[PDB]
């Protein structure tokens, strides 16, 4: 799971 | 089977999942052609990319990522359909080669 902790966008 | 259509499952979908959100998620990493959002095994979407390579790039970069901090976790697999068809462009389906209205 190499993308664990990756976040893509500001929270709405 | 590898394919240019991905199936996205959005775990813990605390915020709305619309085509504009998924376009901003997916298209920077793989060029998107069409998006269809539906409810089946939770909130899910198929995203058709321009090529298998583009779908592989999106799958690699986004699988296991959260759209927003602490929620909206992506589980990504190859979809069964080889193509997507969009009835109309609205919040739940969109063809990025065609106009709104």
Numbering used by the authors:
A (entry chain C): 2182 to 2193
B (entry chain A): 164 to 264
The authors write:
The RNA recognition motif (RRM) binds to nucleic acids as well as proteins. Here we describe the mode of interaction between hnRNP L and LL with the methyltransferase SETD2. We demonstrate that for the interaction to occur, a leucine pair within a highly conserved stretch of SETD2 insert their side chains in hydrophobic pockets formed by hnRNP L RRM2. Notably, the SETD2 binding region in RRM2 is distinct from its RNA-binding interface.
HnRNP LL has a very similar amino acid sequence with 68% sequence identity and domain organization to its paralog hnRNP L. Immunoblotting of the purified complexes with anti-SETD2 and anti-HA antibodies demonstrated that similar to hnRNP L, the RRM2 of hnRNP LL interacts with SETD2. The ITC result showed that hnRNP LL binds to SETD22167–2192 with a mean KD value of 8.27 ± 0.28 μM, which is slightly weaker than that of hnRNP L (higher KD value suggests lower binding affinity). In the sequence alignment of RRM2 of hnRNP L vs. LL, we noted that the residues belonging to the SETD2 binding surface are highly conserved, except that I214 of hnRNP L corresponds to a Val in hnRNP LL. Next, we generated a hnRNP LLV188I mutant and performed ITC and found that it shows nearly the same binding affinity with SETD22167–2192 as that of hnRNP L. We next tried to crystallize the hnRNP LL RRM2–SETD22167–2192 complex but did not succeed. However, we got a high-resolution structure when a truncated peptide encompassing the core interacting motif of SETD2 2180SNPNAGKVLLPTP2192 was used for crystallization. We determined the structure in the P1 space group at a 1.60 Å resolution, with two almost similar hnRNP LL RRM2-SETD22180–2192 complexes in each crystallographic asymmetric unit. HnRNP LL-SETD22180–2192 structure shows high similarity to the structure of hnRNP L- SETD22167-2192complex (RMSD = 0.672 Å over 92 aligned Cα atoms). Similar results were observed when the binding of hnRNP LL RRM2 with SETD22180–2192 was tested and found to be weaker as compared to binding with SETD22167–2192.
